Amino acid sequence: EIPLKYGATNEGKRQDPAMQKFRDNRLGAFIHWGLYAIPGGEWNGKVYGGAAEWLKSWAKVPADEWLKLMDQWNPTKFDAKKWAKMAKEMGTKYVKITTKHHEGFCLWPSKYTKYTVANTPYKRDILGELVKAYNDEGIDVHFYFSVMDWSNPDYRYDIKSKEDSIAFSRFLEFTDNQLKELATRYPTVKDFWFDGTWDASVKKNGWWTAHAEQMLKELVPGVAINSRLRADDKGKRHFDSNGRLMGDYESGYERRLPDPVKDLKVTQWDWEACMTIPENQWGYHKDWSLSYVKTPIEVIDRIVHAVSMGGNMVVNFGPQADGDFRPEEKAMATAIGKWMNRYGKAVYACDYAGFEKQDWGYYTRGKNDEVYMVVFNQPYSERLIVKTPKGITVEKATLLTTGEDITVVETTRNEYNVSVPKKNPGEPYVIQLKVRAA
Ligand SMILES: C[C@@H]1N[C@@H](c2nc3ccccc3[nH]2)[C@H](O)[C@@H]1O
Numbered sequence: 047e048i049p050l051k052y053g054a055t056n057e058g059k060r061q062d063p064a065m066q067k068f069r070d071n072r073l074g075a076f077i078h079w080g081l082y083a084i085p086g087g088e089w090n091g092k093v094y095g096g097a098a099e100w101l102k103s104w105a106k107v108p109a110d111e112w113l114k115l116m117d118q119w120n121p122t123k124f125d126a127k128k129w130a131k132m133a134k135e136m137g138t139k140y141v142k143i144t145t146k147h148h149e150g151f152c153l154w155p156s157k158y159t160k161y162t163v164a165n166t167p168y169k170r171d172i173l174g175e176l177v178k179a180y181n182d183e184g185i186d187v188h189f190y191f192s193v194m195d196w197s198n199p200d201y202r203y204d205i206k207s208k209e210d211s212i213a214f215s216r217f218l219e220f221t222d223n224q225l226k227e228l229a230t231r232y233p234t235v236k237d238f239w240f241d242g243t244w245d246a247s248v249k250k251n252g253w254w255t256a257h258a259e260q261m262l263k264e265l266v267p268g269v270a271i272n273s274r275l276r277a278d279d280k281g282k283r284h285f286d287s288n289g290r291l292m293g294d295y296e297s298g299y300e301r302r303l304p305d306p307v308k309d310l311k312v313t314q315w316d317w318e319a320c321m322t323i324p325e326n327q328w329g330y331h332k333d334w335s336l337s338y339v340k341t342p343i344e345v346i347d348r349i350v351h352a353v354s355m356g357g358n359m360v361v362n363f364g365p366q367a368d369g370d371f372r373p374e375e376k377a378m379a380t381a382i383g384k385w386m387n388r389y390g391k392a393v394y395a396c397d398y399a400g401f402e403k404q405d406w407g408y409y410t411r412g413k414n415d416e417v418y419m420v421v422f423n424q425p426y427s428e429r430l431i432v433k434t435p436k437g438i439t440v441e442k443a444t445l446l447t448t449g450e451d452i453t454v455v456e457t458t459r460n461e462y463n464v465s466v467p468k469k470n471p472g473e474p475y476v477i478q479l480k481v482r483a484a
Contacts, residue, residue, distance in 0.1 A: 047288060052256040053278045054290035059316055064268025065294065068236065069316055070395040071139035071186060072353050073386070074360035075379075076320055077129075078190075078328040079172075080147045081115040083367040086332035095336050098364070099147055099329030102196060109197055112149060119166035124369025126172075126179035132371065133185055136379040137386030139394065140186035140236070142320075142360055145173055145228060147190075147329075148242055150197025154231065158223045161197045177232050186236045188270075189228055193221060194242030204246040214247055218254050225258065229265040238262055239297065240275035249281035259293065272297035272318070291315050295358075303351050306403045310355070313398045318358040321348055323378060330364040334374060342381035343422075346474060349382075349393065350420045354408035356398040385473070388447055392418035392476045402433045407474070417479040418446070424470065429463035430477070436460070437484040446476035 059065070078099055087098040089105035096104045102112045133141055146152045154173035155164035163172050180187050195201050200217040202210045229235065243255065259271045273284040276292030284298065285291055295316035303319055304312045322328055323345070325337040345361060352359040361382070363375050371379075386393065392410050399409035399417050407422040419430060432440060432454075443452035443464050453465040464477060 048280070050279045050286055050288065052252045053286035053288060054292050055256075055259075056291070056294065060294055062268060064236065065270065065316070067186070068140075068270050068295070069358070069397075072358050072393050072396065073138055073349055074140040074142055074188070074318075074358065075133055075136065075138045076142045076190070076328075076360045076362040077176075077365065078144050078147065078330075078362060079153065079365045080144055080149055080329060081112070081119065081151045082147070082149065082329040083365060084115050084118050086330050086367065087327075088332060093333055093336075097326055097328055098331035099149075102149055109199075113151065113161055113197060116151065116161065116166045118367075119163070120168045121172075121365075121367060121369030122168075123366075124168075124172070124175075126175035127182075129176060130179040130183045130185060132376070132379055133180060134183045136361075136383040137390055138185065138361075140188055141176075141180050142188040142190050142237070142239055143173065143176060144190045144192075146192055146195070146224070148192050148194050148196050150192075150195040152224070154228065156224055156227060158220060158227065159197065173232065177234060181234055187232070187234065188237035188239055189232070189235050190239045190241060191225065191228070192242040193240060193248060193275075194245060195221075202245075202247045205250055210247075214251075218251070222258070222261065225262060226265065229262055229269075233266065235266055235269065237270040237272070238275075239272045243275055243277070244283070246281075249277050249283065252277040252279055252281060255292075270294040274298075299352075299357075303348060304355055304357075306351070306355060306408070313356040316358075317356070318360060319348075319352050320360040320362065321345070322362045323375065328362055328364060330366055330372070339374065342378055342385070343474060345378065346382060346385055347422055350408050350410065350422075350474075353393050353396050354398065354410050354420070389420070389474075389476045391416075391446065392420055392478075400435055402435075404431050404433070406430050415481065417481050419443075419464065419477040419479060420474060421466075421477065422474045424466065428466045430466060431457075432462045432464050432479070434460055434462070434481070439482050439484075440464075440479055441482055442480040444478045444480075446478050447471075452477055 082099040094104040152162040156162050200213040202214045255276045271293045273293040273296045277283045278286040280287045299319040324339050349359040396410040399411035401409045407420045410418045443454045455463045
């Protein structure tokens with residue numbers, strides 16, 4: 047039904063090695079760094095509560111005046127090796143980096159616009175330095191790219207005339223030029239994560255979205271492309287008019303994750319969630335008292351939740367103007383890293399286990415049929431309920447960290463009580479199950 051020139055291309059999950067790597071990585075970090083870091087949510091004595099990276103919009107700053115922030119771009123504390131070390135110690139396996147946000151300032155020295163790092167006091171190719179430094183630590187790099195661009199007067203939100211259609215065609219060619227540049231200048235890039243593709247102008251030019259995906263896949267072998275890029279012949283986004291996923295993975299969940307009981311459909315495709323530490327700040331905002339700020343355990347909960355349902359999780363950071371990270375973000379990265387060093391066998395290279403969800407936490411499945419119980423909510427009963435699928439039995443339980451044997455008691459036909467450890471681990475913890483299928 048509904049025939050389409052620009053609808054889905056993959057049927058089912060890609061299983062080539064590059065997609066396996068994307069998937070197995072599981073845990074990433076996001077970097078939102080751009081001129082917005084300089085004002086940090088404040089303009090002319092007013093602190094705006096909205097997302098800092100959107101301050102141009104909240105304070106109604108004309109482009110030319112916003113882009114003059116370039117004269118203040120001088121992050122003297124920037125050190126790409128230090129950033130890569132922070133990422134490595136956090137336990138991230140990849141980093142997604144804002145190459146260009148809506149504002150249109152480029153973190154690489156683009157030859158297609160003057161609004162780049164090259165034309166700042168700092169001069170240096172930030173994106174290039176990061177690529178090298180993260181790659182040297184064995185960390186994959188993914189590129190965020192905003193199609194919407196507030197610095198280019200050829201951009202259009204909608205096509206309402208011939209003059210608009212011509213300006214927008216130029217814009218699309220400009221866009222292609224930047225994308226080709228990114229793909230050829232940084233050939234180790236593993237993914238392009240598009241944003242700012244929701245306007246009517248883009249929805250009417252589905253053909254371009256398909257072309258952008260194909261173009262990049264020809265330039266970068268095995269590259270992944272997110273769903274958000276893609277609009278079909280009819281302007282339907284992410285999933286085409288026949289309900290098929292466009293791009294290589296679904297990129298949708300930001301505020302909330304799929305429901306572990308009601309949204310099991312997501313296990314059928316690759317997907318990646320991205321999350322902020324405050325409620326809704328991606329770029330650096332100077333005042334984190336303005337909204338709820340997640341604790342490390344709340345973030346770890348979300349990371350395991352995503353992997354338990356077959357998805358990746360990416361934790362966002364908004365570096366300071368000076369090129370260092372704020373104390374709250376250093377604390378977060380360090381806490382996550384300490385937990386991942388202990389428990390990361392239940393995260394990396396893991397996936398949906400096919401077990402009925404229980405209240406204590408989440409299951410994940412390893413590559414050799416290990417089933418991990420990740421416990422976030424400790425039962426006063428001191429018993430962790432495990433209901434197995436038809437034909438599956440539990441043969442052993444072990445505490446991950448110490449190897450100590452944990453008692454498993456059959457309670458009914460398809461159900462066990464797995465005891466909690468003899469000593470309360472004092473933090474979310476992992477019990478590994480050995481299971482057998484009839
Ligand atoms: C990953 C996130 N996507 C950007 C964005 N643009 C939006 C436009 C409308 C509503 C929400 C938006 N989030 C945010 O600035 C951030 O980059």
